Design a protein around this ligand. Structure first.
Ligand SMILES: Nc1ncnc2c1ncn2[C@@H]1O[C@H](COP(=O)(O)OP(=O)(O)O)[C@@H](O)[C@H]1O
Ligand SMILES: Nc1ncnc2c1ncn2[C@@H]1O[C@H](COP(=O)(O)OP(=O)(O)O)[C@@H](O)[C@H]1O
Ligand SMILES: [Mg+2]
Ligand SMILES: [Mg+2]
Lengths: 121, 235, 234, 120
């Protein structure tokens, strides 16, 4: 039922997150950079966005910025799943419009629990 | 110096946590999902943990080799190696990593094979893998014709291996500093490419232990060319 | 300071993260190559090793990341009202396993009555408590039945004086000053096979000094060691 | 039938090496350090010794030395399984009497076929 836009440049990361998302029942759509993620938003409007920070072409902070300046995308919840484990990196993402930030390495159990929280809100 | 050391330490944390994220996520998924996980997926998920450990091992071997080369406790046992074969086996190891970034791995030869040479095969394989990895890592971001070509040649009573690419390129202010320990070209393009800045420092020392040299020619946008000369004969 | 420690430090990271990897690799390939010859209780046991060894591995990278932050002046404290009395039992729990694994007993008492309120960052002081507790286990006596790591809580000088006592190998007097330096380790036959980067106490020294606190040590070669951590209350 | 002496301070590594050894029908007797390893040689004589270098109380080079000094222990094959990946580490162990040196991390498949080589 619920659609989830998966955004990460790592193919290995996308696979295991897609597995746990599909194991609950959520359909997923993948995007290997920030620009493709925004390109695919013209096709459909997801119920959740799992977003990486570091990636080529367009990065996650500029995605988070562009999601707010457009009216249609700004009320979609965003979980930032990223390798950047700094406090000032978290605070920038939350200020840019991200609803939650999770550090890598991550627990799939805790990650899915947070995905449930935002979808069942 | 020091400001670099600090960046270096941060770079180890970043490059090493990428395969660890996979190892940790795939392992917990297999553990928590044994009931709802078919056999081919289990084997596939096991294979990811094994492959991500091998990359994680190679990065630790980069740290170990650097400390051995810094302390001057690394040997160089030479033997009659076929260099034309040795480059091909090195290229086969990179093919998987090259396919991930849409990079082609060519091997051309100006002189006819087999090319005999008296060098350490283990350490020259490490030299070629470093240059091949940098060809894939620092390639163009969005392009259809990305490649890494290894040109073998014989010159100056030695062997001149050239590692050509059409990647991002290196600016002239950095061209001298690329071979230094911990050095990386900090820019908007290379913000998300992992690395310690040890590879070329390890490669310069290994090449200079053989009585050879390494240098670079590059243009920003076009690509880079890494020339490495080594002597052939024993005496 | 010296690019000599730096050289030793790079080797120490390699050595340190090479252990949990040896496990991760060996257990993963074993599960992969022996699916037909593993009962289910072992498969879960083997998968759990991979998982636990990864957490050691990660903890180890947080040490490198936190240190780099301390060096860059990036870490900054967010203080709050917390009960160092539990926050200490908590920590102690988090190292329970590591301890047993070493035949070490982790005790805890308080010279004043609990609870003991104090305005501190619970995450960063947990990291300070863990480092000192983990050092107590790491550098305990090699062959003994009465080895321990005791945490003593107290209030002194308008501040909270946490003491981490042990009866381990001890520290020589020429090293007493240098133990808190980054990359420094006491090189000896007793500390030959023990893994470590030399960052833990340097990280602990900066966290405690960001709170307007201090850390010092008294030690005796053979008897044991005592690490005193003074922090202001508010 | 075959008895193998497993000598390593890591209990995690002892378990997975013992599992792969027992998977090939070998008997396994473990040792926490070099001093315990030599104490158990009074009870029985193993067909193979899997030996670590870095251990407390007594290290692997000390074990390899004392194995040569005793007459009965000299001809027992030894595979050194160790985290020390130096070339000068390997040459020291081979001169001290080790038949083979494998580095950690290791492949369980490659380790077992090398164990089979020395026994057969
Ligand atoms: N083939 C290449 N193409 C473009 N840039 C390169 C190439 N090889 C090396 N470099 C530059 O040199 C720097 C250091 O490279 P190296 O010493 O291999 O360490 P690392 O790859 O870990 O950064 C990099 O930041 C990169 O910009
Ligand atoms: N509780 C202790 N008992 C004995 N020695 C200690 C203790 N804590 C620290 N040390 C000494 O201080 C040195 C540096 O400690 P630390 O900064 O924690 O780095 P490491 O992770 O290498 O132990 C060690 O080499 C050790 O000898
Ligand atoms: Mg990324
Ligand atoms: Mg050991």
């Amino acid at each position: 039922s619920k659609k989830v836009l998966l955004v990460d440049d790592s193919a290995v990361l996308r696979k295991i997150v897609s597995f746990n998302l599909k194991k609950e029942g959520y359909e997923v759509i993948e995007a290997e950079n920030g620009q493709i993620a925004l390109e695919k938003l013209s096709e459909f409007t997801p119920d959740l966005i799992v977003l990486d920070i570091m990636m080529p072409v367009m990065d996650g902070f500029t995605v988070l910025k562009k999601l707010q300046e457009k009216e249609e995308w700004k009320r979609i919840p965003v979980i930032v799943l990223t390798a950047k484990g700094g406090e000032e990196d978290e605070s920038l993402a939350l200020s840019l419009g991200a609803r939650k930030v999770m550090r890598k390495p991550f627990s799939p159990s805790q990650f899915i629990e947070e995905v449930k929280h935002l979808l069942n809100e | 110096i020091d400001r670099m050391k600090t960046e270096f330490i941060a770079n180890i944390s970043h490059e090493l946590r990428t395969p660890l994220t996979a190892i940790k996520a795939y392992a917990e998924t297999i553990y928590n999902s044994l009931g709802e996980l078919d056999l081919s997926t289990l084997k596939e998920f096991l294979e990811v943990i094994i492959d991500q450990s091998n990359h994680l091992e190679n990065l630790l071997n980069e740290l170990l080799d650097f400390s051995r080369l810094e302390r001057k406790s690394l040997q160089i046992n030479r033997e009659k190696v076929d260099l034309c074969d040795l480059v091909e086996s090195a290229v086969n190891a990179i093919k998987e990593f090259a396919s991930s970034h849409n990079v082609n791995v060519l091997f051309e030869s100006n002189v006819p094979c087999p090319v005999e040479a008296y060098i350490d095969p283990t350490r020259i394989r490490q030299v070629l893998l470093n240059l091949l990895n940098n060809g894939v890592k620092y390639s163009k971001k969005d392009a259809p014709d990305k490649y890494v070509k290894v040109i073998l040649d014989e010159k100056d009573g030695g062997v001149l291996i050239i590692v050509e690419d059409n990647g991002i390129g290196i600016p002239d202010h950095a061209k001298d500093r690329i071979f230094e320990q911990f050095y990386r070209v900090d820019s908007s393009l290379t913000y998300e490419v992992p690395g310690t800045g040890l590879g070329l420092a390890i490669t310069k020392e290994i090449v200079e232990l053989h009585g050879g040299r390494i240098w670079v020619e590059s243009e920003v946008g076009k690509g880079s060319r890494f020339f490495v000369w080594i002597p052939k004969d024993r005496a």
